[PDB]
Amino acid sequence: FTYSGTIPYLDGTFYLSHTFRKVAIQFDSSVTWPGNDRLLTPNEFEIKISVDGEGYNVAQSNMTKDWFLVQMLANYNIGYQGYHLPPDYKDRTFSFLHNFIP
Amino acid sequence: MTFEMDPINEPTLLYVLFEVFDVARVHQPHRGVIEVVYLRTPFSAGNA
Amino acid sequence: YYNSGGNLGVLAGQSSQLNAVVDLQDRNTELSYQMLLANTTDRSRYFSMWN
Amino acid sequence: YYNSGGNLGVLAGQSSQLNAVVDLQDRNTELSYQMLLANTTDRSRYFSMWN
Amino acid sequence: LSAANMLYPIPPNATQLPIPSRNWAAFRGWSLTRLKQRETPALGSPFDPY
Amino acid sequence: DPRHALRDPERKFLCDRTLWRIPFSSNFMSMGSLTDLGQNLLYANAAHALD
Amino acid sequence: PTHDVTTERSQRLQLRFVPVDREDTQYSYKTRFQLAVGDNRVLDMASTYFD
Amino acid sequence: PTHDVTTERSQRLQLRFVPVDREDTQYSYKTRFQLAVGDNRVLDMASTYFD
C-alpha cells in the first residue's frame, strides 16, 4: 500500500461512476431482472449510450432515459409524476442529482 | 463442461445450444384480445 | 429485428394493449427459421419471393 | 476454524437457507475431540490419515 | 430450434475452455459449434460499432 | 465566427461522491426498508443463483 | 405493501410515441400523436414531455 | 362442395395496410400497422408479409 491520498473505499470519495456502460442482472442464469419488459431495453440497464441512434439520452447528456428514471426513483421517488428538482433536505452530498453535472 | 479444441490465431466463440422446450399457448377469449403464455424449461429466465 | 429487447416487435389488440410478443435475446429466431426450412422442403431450389 | 463467530462454518439446505451450525466461542471443539479419542481408542497408536 | 443460445469467448491460441452453469430441471440435449468473433455481430443492442 | 470550420458534438457527464442504485422493488420506489419483492414468496421459499 | 400496489404482468414503465402526422411550415412545426392509455392504467401528464 | 365453404358476398382476398406511424431512425426504421380482421373472417399470419 504505497498511497496516502483519499480512500474512496472508506471516506466515500468515489469519482468513477461515469465509467460504466451497462449492467445485466439475471436469476438462475436465465430469468433476467426485472424483466417483464419494464425498461426500454428490458434485457439490461444501459447507463449511457455512445451512438445516439434513437436518442435514449436525456438531460442533454449521454445518459439513457431508463437509467435517469431509475436513479430518480431510488433517490427521491420522483419520475412517475414528472421530473423536478427534489427538496433540498433530500439533496445531500451523497445524493444523485446533487452531483450530476452534464 | 470442458471443451478442448485446436488453437487458432484469432478470437473465436463457443456456440452452445441447450436444447429445451420453448412453447407458448395463445388464448383469444374476446374480440381483439390476445393473451399468450410462454414457457421455456429449463432456463425459464436466465440462470442465477 | 429479432431476439432484441431493444427493438422488440409488438402485436396486441387495441383493447388489450398487452403485447403478445415476448422475445428474449437468448433465443435465436433467424437460425431457427433456417433449419426449419431444411426439414420441410428441399433447401436446394430457389424462390425469389422470399429471396 | 472452530468456536469462532468470525469464521463460523455453514451447513444448510439450499431451500432452507437456515444454517444448522451454531457455534459459540465459549465452547472448545478442539480439546473436546482430543479427549473423545482417548476414551474410545488407544491413543498410543498412530494413524497417518488423520495425522 | 427450441434451445437457449450461449456464447463464450475463446482467447486466441486458447486450447481449454471451461463453462460453469446449472439447470434446476431436465432439458433435451446439447448442441454446439465454433464461430469467429469478427464474423459474429453482437446482438441485443440496436447497433454494433465494432 | 465566419472562419468557423466544420466540427462535431460530444456529450458526457460526471457524478462523484455517489453510488449507483438499483432498488429491489417492483417499481424501484422506496415504500419501506423491507421492500415488497424482498418479501415475495418466490424468494423466501426457494433459493436462486445470481449473475 | 405486498399486494394491490404493483402489477405482476409485463408492462412498460415509459412508452414512446411517434408522430402520426407532421407538417413543417416555413415558420412553424406541427405534429399530432395518438396518446393511447392502455386499459387498467393511469397516465399523469406531468410525466409526459416532447423529446 | 357447394355450400359452407366460400362466401357469396363481396370480400377482398388480400388486403393492404398503410403505416399509421413511421419513424426513420439513423440506424433503424420502425412502423406500426393497425391489422384489422373483419368479422366473420380468419387471418393466417403465415400469409402476411412486409412489402
From Swiss-Prot, chains C, D:
Induction data: Expressed in the late phase of the viral replicative cycle.
Localization annotation: Virion; Host nucleus
Assembly and binders: Homotrimer. Interacts with the capsid vertex protein; this interaction binds the peripentonal hexons to the neighboring penton base. Interacts with the hexon-linking protein; this interaction tethers the hexons surrounding the penton to those situated in the central plate of the facet. Interacts with the hexon-interlacing protein; this interaction lashes the hexons together. Interacts with host dyneins DYNC1LI1 and DYNC1I2; this interaction might be involved in intracellular microtubule-dependent transport of incoming viral capsid.
Family: Belongs to the adenoviridae hexon protein family.
Job description of the protein: Major capsid protein that self-associates to form 240 hexon trimers, each in the shape of a hexagon, building most of the pseudo T=25 capsid. Assembled into trimeric units with the help of the chaperone shutoff protein. Transported by pre-protein VI to the nucleus where it associates with other structural proteins to form an empty capsid. Might be involved, through its interaction with host dyneins, in the intracellular microtubule-dependent transport of incoming viral capsid to the nucleus.
Additional observations: All late proteins expressed from the major late promoter are produced by alternative splicing and alternative polyadenylation of the same gene giving rise to non-overlapping ORFs. A leader sequence is present in the N-terminus of all these mRNAs and is recognized by the viral shutoff protein to provide expression although conventional translation via ribosome scanning from the cap has been shut off in the host cell.
Name of the protein in its database record: Hexon protein
Source organism per UniProt: Bovine adenovirus B serotype 3
Upper classification of the organism: Viruses, Varidnaviria, Bamfordvirae, Preplasmiviricota, Tectiliviricetes
Gene expressing this chain: L3
Full-length numbering of the shown residues: 305 to 355 of 911
